[PDB]
Design a protein around this ligand. Structure first.
Ligand code: NA
Ligand code: NA
Ligand code: NA
Ligand code: NA
Ligand code: NA
Lengths: 398, 398, 398, 398, 398
């Protein structure tokens, strides 16, 4: 399911669909954030915004929450993240060096291939504790029903004194806007310099969203607390040894949707990770109920996309680090021109449905032979060939 | 329930409501499609598009899917249709002249009075195998949540090389946009002329959406396959020997909603079929939770519609083949000027609720006598008359 | 949950947030209705309209229904109201002075502190039978999914011949628009002067929505009828001896949401009533999933609101009878400058979720100590103070 | 809805139905508990157990939880109760005489007429702070799906050293069963006499479930905390100024079901409170989907109950403090022989449905006249009398 | 949630609770199956049966389905399993050495710590491809609503000619019961020796449920197909780097319930994996809504269990490979007497709720101080100690 705002008149009427690369980079201390322009037609149509975060060893992306739900895919690396679900008690705690030292909400490990769901207004932070840079691609669903503000994807930063991620595309931290007397009362701290730091007064716009932790972070990691407050918030789909669709001579597909990661039901979002081997084809298909935002992860594939007029709105080699939006119901097909073309496709429904146009149990396969024969002007025998020559589903070997 | 986009500022503020007739006809080989202009205020307000299809004996409306959910009402005729639900296995099959000849998804018979639900992105085809022309009136819900593209009702045609139904009102087939090398791989057909026909290369813009089948079509007709893949997709309401509301001296009403046809729950749509006998009245009423799109089927009725200012925005004889949109909450009443005025009313909710203003259990009937007396400046006795003189619900005899 | 239309581009981007007072008063016989301009940025952002009704002893607000769901809070007074749920049989009846005198739908008592839910298209009337004026503050959710007309909050009046509440802000009664011959047939009344009064012909635009009942109203008050037709439609939250959050030295909070008043689930709305004692603080917090429309009921409080840029968009004393909209996710904090500051806060979700930024189980409390230390540049000890110095939730004593 | 275990073979086959009075009293310090024998046929059939608690001024019924869901009706008196929902944070707190003194879960006020829902395993305590004795009648649903133990209604007492309520009918406190070394570690109390008292070692079997608090109790009373952790758990139905069905010359009915008190949906239980005035009749009716456990509150009524053989299994004056079980689908009718007969009827469904056999919209009223005429051997005119002579619903005046 | 049959009268009334070890072993070719007697009081009470499977390198547990839902926990080892969901198309396929070689349903990898959900009537097979023996502990929910046969847990074996697992405890394969002429027609195999083998005719009762695959198995592994047919059926909880509750000085807990593994919602089952370090305590607690079936995985713990009479029904060292049933609502506490006591606890609800009796946010912590003081006969100060001395949740360090 999904419940989203429709795009403005004509947004999904295309002369041509363009693949997109980021157009801005925001520098910080231990990494950076790159943004795709959400004002481009492809993104206006899909009603979403996209960004990419790089976190070096010991870098902390300091906590923030957003008005629009997010899905974050971990392209590379491993580390820790927390989500703060409001009012949920702490369940991670340690004895002083019995009295209590520190306690906090569950800290999660993440790995390459993980897809993480961040509900609207839930605070998120991410940390890399390893050499390999973490690279995360974040889809922010601006048109989602859950966003009751206008279609600007905001980051409400809990810390720092820097530029909002997507501010440059529109026509300080959250604490920094409150007066010192409110914050001293709120936190019962008399130390006016505790409140100064809280407000970000002891830093420039160039410390950024991401800080490096000298010596590394130490955090705890090996009724309502073990039920709703500890619901699952991520699922591995990129590294998984169990794809949903698999042909060892053509490729694989694996989805994280609301049947795999229940919280996606509330978000109205899902994602798929696919592999397509050299010269293999993902058959013409369309998504009945979702836009697809395809981020090329590795390699390259010749991709074609067809609109409701049968126009070829996109025809080229989709390369690593570029993004192609395939609007709901537009048909798409791809032939990998790499040993293994790899991609993540975010989708704007929690249970997206693929309709294959060719192959076993495809639309053509499921029409009566005489209907295929009469629709295409074909003798009964050539119609039977169209229905039966390809015995495979989804992927076709070289 | 329904989840739809609201109309633009002022769309439902009317100086006058106009009844509408089609304004375009698209010719094909065995029939035609007529469209109502969806840009007219009445349709902008309702957020929907309407069309009418005529299929002569042996005519096939070749498969297509759409971005917006549809409800199709069979005004006359009988025939076969298929819906292709993606990935559902074939369940209709026959032995070669044991090995398998052809197999395909369930083929359904349709009859006059049938209301058929077509979910977003589900492919549909229709065939008439009888002398009587089939006439189908199709409501396309452009503002529906399920449509994540802009508010243009598209037809993604699987076959042919013709004009999109509603294209003329905006500011080739799906295969025709793919290169021949993609389609040969996708269908494993080496015959480049199989792929030519598939793409519609062997036909003009004037073969159209509808083809005639010489000698007639032959199709099969007497776990997940007998459960979800064979869910009901139509319900008879026009020919039914069991209306929901009935008075043999005034008229009848029968609804297909989500309690009768479960799939309507996902579509957010329903329809009603009514009869009103000469000089009988359907009392002033309004729909709490839906627009009503009234297509006159037979005869004529004097209809009045009142807006939130108590203005009479419509006051005339609604005739057969004209359409009147009654916006949500506007009050409407009708007096049949024909032996039997017959109408289908599509509604933009899966469970629309009628609030009668006069008659048994109406709004007036359910207010305390002293409230009716004090609201209208009436003596207790004249208030009692207003509540009680009409003992009938919905319809009132001549 | 809620399903609402998003506001236009930039609506929730504020240079400053203004508190608002009503800007129009509509006079009637036994009371008046005051409206806030819904075109002001604060209301455009929230997608809602607000009004205030005053009903003197024996005054009847004559029946009406609206396209948008309402929540009405009873600030003062007591009286009777009815809601007319269409087609539900009468369940209140009396013997003639056995035959039946009058019968009607359930009449409800209301009291100060009551929050009443009025679904879209359900007719409502209100009566005051006591000396104390009734004062009701009404939130109309114009952007709600249930409103399938444009974003004008309409009142479809069943009686009278006066001005629609919100008409002055856009770019007769319902019966008055029908011809006398339709109404005589509909109600089977031959008396053409019964129909004249019904249409409001025997009154000026200056009798208004509210009439005085001379001698007072007499009404009855001590399967589907005792189940769905008598579902609960109100909950006391202002006068309640059982707040949800309570600290006798700082304040209280009490909510009516879909867990307390089930019908709110369909409306997508809820409300909260809070008390804050002199010099006590409601800590910086935000609502994850709702706009807050704060109506000051008694006293005054210094309030600050911070946007996604950390800008202080509102900083002043919120006074009784003024309204402050806090957009979804914006942070807000308040310090009462009165013996008891009292407020109702309507919220645009049926289950709104508050995320406290300071105090026990707040966002800061639930982050690892080393994350708070590294986010704010603080030694481990000053981080521990930020997490632990305030042991209270929500409210902090003077 | 409800999900319950069916009774053993023949349990609901009755020679006669007997009204029942309690058969045991358990004495304590400030009040007592009386139990009805759950082994009697009437209770075996209904699959439930019943008890009655009396709490004098300053008496505390010390905390306990049970394996079966309960509904408690407050027949008289007023006081405080708490329910402990596991893991929910405290939301009632006070400053030490800023640091925190005590904090605890919400304390609720209760009043006469309140119906309180206690889910399976949720701990409950009750306190009377007024002169008038509190009298509470408790229905324990032993056959409920939520009880996964055998059909013995247990009380797991958190305190005391006394007899389990229903133990005498089968074929120490919870802490008392743990060894002192477990409890010292669990509560980190070194004081072995703290643990002695906890275990109930400093008291006899004759301090009982109920203790008197000398000087009276002092308690606090004027994200997940204000949402799920503060869901409503009671609804007034006995004292309510708004019955669901009302005739000032015959009686009233008011229900607390899952549309009024949402938590009842999980419990599978509901209750009704009725008044019937001298010589008035509640018409023959049956409950489609629930047993009815009728506790007479005040006065007396001649009651008759008819089984599936048309046998009169009960025919007598039901008196105050007696209980009559009416099995699902058995027909029942009553004529009050008191100025006002008052009763609470617990029902074993969360949304019980009454089917009236006589009167407006009854079963007879809703059958075609010719069906009533042919079913009873009656001329058309006598059939019309049977359908129409009684114009009232539910109750009929003297 | 769960919907289960209640146990017979007195089943959960215990003189003493006994830990249980298996009492039977069924030998096969590459491993064995051990069963616990389901007729023992502990299992009668819980309404469940338990077994343990060992599969050596290259051993295949041949396909079977059961009348009762199962949860299988992988104690050690790694391998492949399939579940056959009826009518779901194949999604794993390979090209002949383009035509199709073999195709089949998704084959899943499993690892140590995995919890696998097997719905009623879904066929399951398991294979070990590694040196380490796989050991799986299987809970079969005999009293589950989904089992509409009597309370005998059956295995309907698709292959083999051996003893049913639990047959010895009651008062050939599925094909073997059909006549050869039915099977030849059903599979269109003329070879009467193909059908002989299918029926298990070419093997003794001593080939067993488990076969060894010489040279090892080769299987494929790297619309409705990628949605419902590929829903998740397992979740790792034993090996997971992210417990729900964690204290590095006492222990951890991690649950797989319906918020983590959605299919458990239909099964009415869940499981927890816990670690408890030497001399640490899991505080007295109870489960509100589930039986707990505790299988000791490693080490030993002193465990005590208390019934509704405060009787200590179990008091001893629970050792590895023994099982202890803790009935719903009975209180339990454990102190590890090993470096790391490890256990899996199956629970008879899809969302079981733990109610802690001591510690932060426990039942005692959430009662008003004066209620704890008056319930236990304690001065205000000793009551405060009981509420506050243990600042930890669930686990308490040595
Ligand atoms: Na298009
Ligand atoms: Na209007
Ligand atoms: Na902002
Ligand atoms: Na009987
Ligand atoms: Na017991």
């Amino acid at each position: 399911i999904s419940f989203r705002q429709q795009p403005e008149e004509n947004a999904c009427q295309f002369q041509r669909l363009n693949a997109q690369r980021p157009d801005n980079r925001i520098e910080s201390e231990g990494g950076y954030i790159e943004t795709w322009n959400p004002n481009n037609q492809e993104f206006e149509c899909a009603g979403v915004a996209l960004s990419r975060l790089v976190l070096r060893r010991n870098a902390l992306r300091r906590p923030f929450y957003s008005n629009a739900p997010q899905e974050i895919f971990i392209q590379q690396g491993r580390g820790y993240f927390g989500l703060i679900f409001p009012g949920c008690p702490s369940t991670y705690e340690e004895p002083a060096q019995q009295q209590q030292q520190d306690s906090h909400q569950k800290v999660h490990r993440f790995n390459e291939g993980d897809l993480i769901a961040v509900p609207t207004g839930v605070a998120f932070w991410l940390y890399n504790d390893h050499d390999t840079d973490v690279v995360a691609v974040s889809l922010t669903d601006t048109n989602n029903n859950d966003n009751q503000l206008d279609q600007f994807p905001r980051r409400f930063n809990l810390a720092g004194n820097h530029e909002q991620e997507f501010l440059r595309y529109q026509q300080g931290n959250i604490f920094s806007g409150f007066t010192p007397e409110f914050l001293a009362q709120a936190f019962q701290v008399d130390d006016r310099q505790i409140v100064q730091n809280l407000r970000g007064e002891n830093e420039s716009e160039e410390q950024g969203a991401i800080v490096t932790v000298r010596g590394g972070l130490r955090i705890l990691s090996p009724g309502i607390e073990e039920t709703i407050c500890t619901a699952t918030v991520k699922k591995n789909i990129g590294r998984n040894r169990s794809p949903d669709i698999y042909n060892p001579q053509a490729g694989s597909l694996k989805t994280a949707n609301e049947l795999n990661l229940l919280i996606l039901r509330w978000l109205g979002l899902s994602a798929e990770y696919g592999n397509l081997y050299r010269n293999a084809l993902f058959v013409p298909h369309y998504n009945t109920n979702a836009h697809s935002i395809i981020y090329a992860l590795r390699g390259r594939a010749h991709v074609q996309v067809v609109d409701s007029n049968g126009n070829r709105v996109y025809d080229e080699e989709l390369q690593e680090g570029h993004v192609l939006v395939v609007p709901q119901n537009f048909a798409v097909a791809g032939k990998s021109q790499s040993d293994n073309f790899e991609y993540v496709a975010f989708k704007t429904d929690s249970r997206p449905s693929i309709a294959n146009l060719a192959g076993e149990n495809s639309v053509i396969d499921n029409l009566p032979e005489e209907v295929v024969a009469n629709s295409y002007g074909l003798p009964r025998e050539q119609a039977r060939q169209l229905k039966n020559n390809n015995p495979f589903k989804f992927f076709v070997p070289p």
